[PDB]
Design a protein that fits this description.
121 residues; binds protoporphyrin IX containing FE; binds cyanide ion; oxygen binding; metal-binding; transport; transit peptide; heme binding
């Protein structure tokens, strides 16, 4: 599984932690999290990614569209690209092989339509 190739639990915990340190230091997206407990957020993101990367059987939290559709200003590709960039940079900083980063980013890309609450075509 991509989850295992990445290093499993320890690796994903490390990635999520570094990821959110970048998120809160980036004015392009940090205000969205001003009323969020970032330890709880780290917990939920790990659980979602474990599922999305093939390390967990299911995800029982909010579906991605419900989770973001009501955030304001409405999310755009500027925000999506900012978050994707932070996750990619985190994996690079953690020494993940570029080919594994590519696979992880494809998983992230697959969430775009729902995360951005866009017409499903
Ligand atoms: C890159 C793709 C993204 C993924 C996979 C993702 C995933 C998630 C997940 C799993 C949750 C938790 C949902 C729950 O409560 O069950 C969440 C919450 C949230 N996300 Fe994202 N997200 C993404 C992008 C973004 C972007 C671009 C923003 C805006 C800058 C954003 C803002 C938020 C906020 C504000 C919350 C909830 C905060 C709270 O409940 O306190 N997310 N996201
Ligand atoms: C997204 N947190």
């Amino acid at each position: 599984s991509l989850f295992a190739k990445l290093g499993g639990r320890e690796a994903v915990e490390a990635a999520v932690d570094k990821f959110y340190n970048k998120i809160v230091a980036d004015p392009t997206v940090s205000t969205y999290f001003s009323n969020t407990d970032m330890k709880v957020q780290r917990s939920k993101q790990f659980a979602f990614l474990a599922y999305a990367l093939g390390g967990a059987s299911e995800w029982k939290g909010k579906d991605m569209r419900t989770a973001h559709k009501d955030l304001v200003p409405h999310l755009s590709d500027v925000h999506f690209q900012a978050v994707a960039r932070h996750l990619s940079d985190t994996l690079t900083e953690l020494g993940v092989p570029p080919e594994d980063i590519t696979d992880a980013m494809a998983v992230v890309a697959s969430t775009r339509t729902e995360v951005l609450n866009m017409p499903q075509q």
